[PDB]
C-alpha cells in the first residue's frame, strides 16, 4: 500500500530489476512471445524471428526509455518525476549487474536473428535499425538528454 510501511526505500522502483527470479522471468517472456509467434500458420521462420526481435525491442524501448515517473506516490516529493525507468535504476549508478544483463540480452537475440535469417539483405536493415534504437539510450553519455526537447515534460 503506502511506501514506507514495511521497507524504508523511498523509491521502490529503483530495486525491482534486482529481485529474485526476475532475470529468469524476463527470458521466459521472450520464449513465450517466440512460441506464440511460431504458431501463426501463414508465416515463415525468418519472418517469425524478425518479428520476435522487433517486438521485443519496441516493448523494451517503451518500458525502459519512454515512460517517466513512478506509478505510485513516494515520500521524496517527486524527485524522479522527469526520469525514465532506465535512469532511476540503482539511483543512477552505472554498470551494475542488471544494467549489464539488459544491455547484453538484445545483442544475443540479434545474433540468433541474423543466423536464422540467412543474413538476408532486406532483414539486416530492419534488425540493425531496431537494435541501435535500444542501444543508444543505454550509453552513459545520454543520461538525461532529450533530442530536440522531445519527451521532456
Amino acid at each position: 500500500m503506502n511506501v514506507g510501511t514495511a521497507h524504508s526505500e523511498v523509491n521502490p522502483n529503483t530495486r525491482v530489476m534486482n529481485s529474485r527470479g526476475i532475470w529468469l522471468s524476463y527470458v521466459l517472456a521472450i520464449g513465450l512471445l517466440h512460441i506464440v509467434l511460431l504458431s501463426i500458420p501463414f508465416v515463415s521462420v525468418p519472418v517469425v524471428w524478425t518479428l520476435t526481435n522487433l517486438i521485443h525491442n519496441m516493448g523494451m524501448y517503451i518500458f525502459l526509455h519512454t515512460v517517466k515517473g513512478t506509478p505510485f506516490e513516494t515520500p521524496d516529493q517527486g524527485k524522479a518525476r522527469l526520469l525514465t525507468h532506465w535512469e532511476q535504476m540503482d539511483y543512477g549508478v552505472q554498470f551494475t549487474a542488471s544494467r549489464k544483463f539488459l544491455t547484453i540480452t538484445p545483442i544475443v537475440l540479434y545474433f540468433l536473428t541474423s543466423f536464422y535469417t540467412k543474413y538476408d539483405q532486406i532483414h539486416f536493415v530492419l534488425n540493425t535499425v531496431s537494435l541501435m534504437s535500444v542501444l543508444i539510450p543505454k550509453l552513459p553519455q545520454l543520461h538525461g538528454v532529450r533530442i530536440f526537447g522531445i519527451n521532456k515534460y
Binding site: 512460441i35 511460431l38 504458431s39 501463426i40 500458420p41
Partner: peptide, 13 residues
C-alpha cells in the same frame, strides 16, 4: 484461441 491455433499448426506441420 492461441492454444487452438497452436494445436492446428502442430498437426499440419
Amino acid at each position: 484461441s492461441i492454444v487452438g491455433m497452436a494445436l492446428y499448426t502442430g498437426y499440419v506441420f
